[PDB]
Amino acid sequence: TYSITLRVFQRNPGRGFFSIVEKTVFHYANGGTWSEAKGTHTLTMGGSGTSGVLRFMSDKGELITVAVGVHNYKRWCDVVTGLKPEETALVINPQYYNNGPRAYTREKQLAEYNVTSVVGTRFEVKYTVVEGNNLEANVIFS
């Protein structure tokens, strides 16, 4: 199995304050489960080849998704911003598979990704433990 444990850092009150509004797990690799402990979020997966998505909403209405997973035994991540209300995590997570429009991002196996949204919010995912089965990453909103 693989696990990915996320710590969420929100840096800048001017961007508003984000909370989780959805959590999905893709069905490959015998699926997986999200759990929470001590304010952290862990995705546990049945092997290499699947992923999960957290969707966040800010108190200013901004919607963004963070995807993490393991592809061919290496971690990957992506952040999608500027989402419409109908673009739920249930819509987004499958887009990384079955030759969907985001598959290329999964294939990159990124240990770090940075993107800034249409309303100016800075997002970074950065793995702090980048190899092995017990992976760790910081999700930073700025």
Next chain:
Amino acid sequence: TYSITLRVFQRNPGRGFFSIVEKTVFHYANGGTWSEAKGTHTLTMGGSGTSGVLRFMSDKGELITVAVGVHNYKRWCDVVTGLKPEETALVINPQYYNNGPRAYTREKQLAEYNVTSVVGTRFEVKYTVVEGNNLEANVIFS
């Protein structure tokens, strides 16, 4: 908009103890969001015609999903038990739409549903506020 607020009642320690491992929102009706407050869980939706699923896992390994939504201006619900690890909420939620195998259950517009699983766990969903836009239901594991 419609909201459905759930209170989870776990009755019987012999069944183990369940926690939420996934939360999905279907993309119809401009989507929606899950939120938590005072130990309760609220699905807020952009109109009639969509839904969301909570997947639960017990500390004895049992996996079950609870689906709630609004179909043609009336609440509906379903509970699916005996799930395999690969049958995530991401798999289950869409099965209520696009002529999927669970669409019939949504169409019933049930205000109450009772089912007992293969390992003997009793599940009930019961709406306590059954009409209007601010719906309320108890989810009982027994």
Next chain:
Amino acid sequence: TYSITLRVFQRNPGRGFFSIVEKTVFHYANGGTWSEAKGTHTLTMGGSGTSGVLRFMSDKGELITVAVGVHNYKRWCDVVTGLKPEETALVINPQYYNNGPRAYTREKQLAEYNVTSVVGTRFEVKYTVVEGNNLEANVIFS
């Protein structure tokens, strides 16, 4: 160290739904901390001879406290019901020490305790692991 992990079972929607409104840790035995994981609550203490209290409020307005700790290397518990708003856990926890009015209950070192409040709500604390340093109990509201 000693830890006590609690699982909260709520049986009867007629009593309303309870959530935690305060958590205290008494200062003996190098204190301790509350943490949450997978819907469970763990009090971790620096040794035998201290305790902590969760105060709960129901959505029907009922206030009650659950105390757990270790006294002379054996677990103990208590439940206090019918609290007034000013009787916070900060008031209650110290009453088990310094010859306070609740010390007698700590001294009993109970592995189980049952009480019914004046409004008819049944409360039970029952330890399912009653010996050693990694203690476990169910807290049952009914």
Next chain:
Amino acid sequence: TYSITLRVFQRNPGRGFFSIVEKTVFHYANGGTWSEAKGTHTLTMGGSGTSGVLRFMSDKGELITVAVGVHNYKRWCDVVTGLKPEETALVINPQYYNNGPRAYTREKQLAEYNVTSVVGTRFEVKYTVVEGNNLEANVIFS
């Protein structure tokens, strides 16, 4: 009633990640309760003249407390760092009253306070709504 709603911002992963390990409510002004909603924390009090404390622990072992309250109809705040394990929030909260050693900080009725701990962690409490009965503050760790 007075309420104080807190949003917690953590800026700098180098300081580690903090989670709440205790929440107290002082017994004056008919007490009060802590609640959580959408990742925010609200202290609801029966009137002016009381307070509550959140104690946080980082995953690097640092212990700190944040006190908020209303004194003579104006908000107040304080932060105490470098705590030993036995200095729980149960010890700290009462120190703001009965001519205790921290009363002077309550009496200042501060809308903002900044402190850096001996290990280099910056803490700020800043009220964003500083008047009326529905007060709001950001708690920033850096």
